Amino acid sequence: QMRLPSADVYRFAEPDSEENIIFEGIPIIKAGTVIKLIERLTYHMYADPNFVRTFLTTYRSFCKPQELLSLIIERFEIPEPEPTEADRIAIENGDQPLSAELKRFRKEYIQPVQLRVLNVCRHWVEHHFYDFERDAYLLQRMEEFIGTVRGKAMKKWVESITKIIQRKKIAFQSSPPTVEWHISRPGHIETFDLLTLHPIEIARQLTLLESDLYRAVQPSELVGSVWTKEDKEINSPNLLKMIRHTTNLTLWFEKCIVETENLEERVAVVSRIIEILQVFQELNNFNGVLEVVSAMNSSPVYRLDHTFEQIPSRQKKILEEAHELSEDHYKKYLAKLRSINPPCVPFFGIYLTNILKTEEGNPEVLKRHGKELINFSKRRKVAEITGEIQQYQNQPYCLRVESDIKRFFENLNPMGNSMEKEFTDYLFNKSLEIEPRNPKPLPRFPKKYSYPLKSPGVRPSNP
């Protein structure tokens, strides 16, 4: 083969050994030092698409962005062998032509490695620009590096990378159905509520909202269970925003239910929420369907036997059928998802559960002769889970946004100023009040709504 740089001048020349890289054409990396991982992330022998994508999605769980950039730049700066004093003089004179060995080295090692590095930089800014958005110094270094790279073969890469960075920094194929209105009138946000807005529109606007929340979540926000750790707000902003939306919506449904003390009005409320679930299902917004199921199964709501006994049989069946989605480890849901095409808002809860388990259930590193190697197979397993999330992030819903309804829901704050525990306890105590435990009979309560409770139904007013 050909002689690579000396270890005392280039760190990525160290031959592979059982102590620096472990494998599972193109072998699969199981573990290794950051150095070897980076070496293979830009291997000169061949391209490694799957490793590049997996590495860029999960590296933060084992290497800082600043250090990664330093490492790939260090990788890029390949030194050439130093000449002797005899060779130096031989060059001043016209003694010999350019070393065929050096020519080969430049062509077979340096150029290919350098191109691999630029390919990583390209994928980095294209799929994970948020690293540079969150760290200005990082963006400066990258731009400085790319901005000084010079070479005929690399010009095209510099151009491409530069274009992506620029556009990142600055930053209906069909007629949608007519917006539906019920009691509340357009523009009159003061009357907006669960029973006053049209159930169809509540479902549509929530689907649009949830679709956007979903599409913004990046896989790296789940890697290393970072959304549950100290720097969660920085590493998982999009994921938290969606989780919080879900918590708030579920709590809002529960709230609407238990605060409606009159039995007939509460039955009306539950029935309307189920109608909303019907439209969520209609739009393939499983996230929404399950938020409803979650509310119905909550401590304060599930125990309201007199309320569920009073809802229409047809809706009891509709709720039962949807409830089956989560049953037995989401067996029915997972099967249903496999044959679904977008637009769709998948249930996210499952991804979080699986990752938490995979993250806790696997070792951060792998011991070899006492040396800690990064367990890359673990990262590949997590990437397998997150890779599924991106499936429905590219197709928008053909539904028109209603800015006022959208705002109403973006601002939902069921808990008011009270805290989590305090509110959850309040809801359960409200449940016990409207439907007391066994011995005590069901007390009657006065109506709280002054408008009709009759639902307009979930069939769009197309005519």
Curated annotation (Swiss-Prot):
Top-rank taxon: Eukaryota
Limits of the Ras-GEF domain: 198-437
Outcome of swapping W157L: In NS4; promotes constitutive RAS activation and enhances ERK activation
Annotated function: Promotes the exchange of Ras-bound GDP by GTP. Probably by promoting Ras activation, regulates phosphorylation of MAP kinase MAPK3/ERK1 in response to EGF. Catalytic component of a trimeric complex that participates in transduction of signals from Ras to Rac by promoting the Rac-specific guanine nucleotide exchange factor (GEF) activity.
Domain N-terminal Ras-GEF: 25-169
UniProt organism field: Homo sapiens (Human)
Subunit-structure text: Interacts (via C-terminus) with GRB2 (via SH3 domain). Forms a complex with phosphorylated MUC1 and GRB2 (via its SH3 domains). Interacts with phosphorylated LAT2. Interacts with NCK1 and NCK2. Part of a complex consisting of ABI1, EPS8 and SOS1.
Tissues/organs with expression: Expressed in gingival tissues.
Disease: Fibromatosis, gingival, 1: A form of hereditary gingival fibromatosis, a rare condition characterized by a slow, progressive overgrowth of the gingiva. The excess gingival tissue can cover part of or the entire crown, and can result in diastemas, teeth displacement, or retention of primary or impacted teeth. GINGF1 is usually transmitted as an autosomal dominant trait, although sporadic cases are common. Noonan syndrome 4: A form of Noonan syndrome, a disease characterized by short stature, facial dysmorphic features such as hypertelorism, a downward eyeslant and low-set posteriorly rotated ears, and a high incidence of congenital heart defects and hypertrophic cardiomyopathy. Other features can include a short neck with webbing or redundancy of skin, deafness, motor delay, variable intellectual deficits, multiple skeletal defects, cryptorchidism, and bleeding diathesis.
Segment of the intact protein contained: 566 to 1045 of 1333
Protein name: Son of sevenless homolog 1
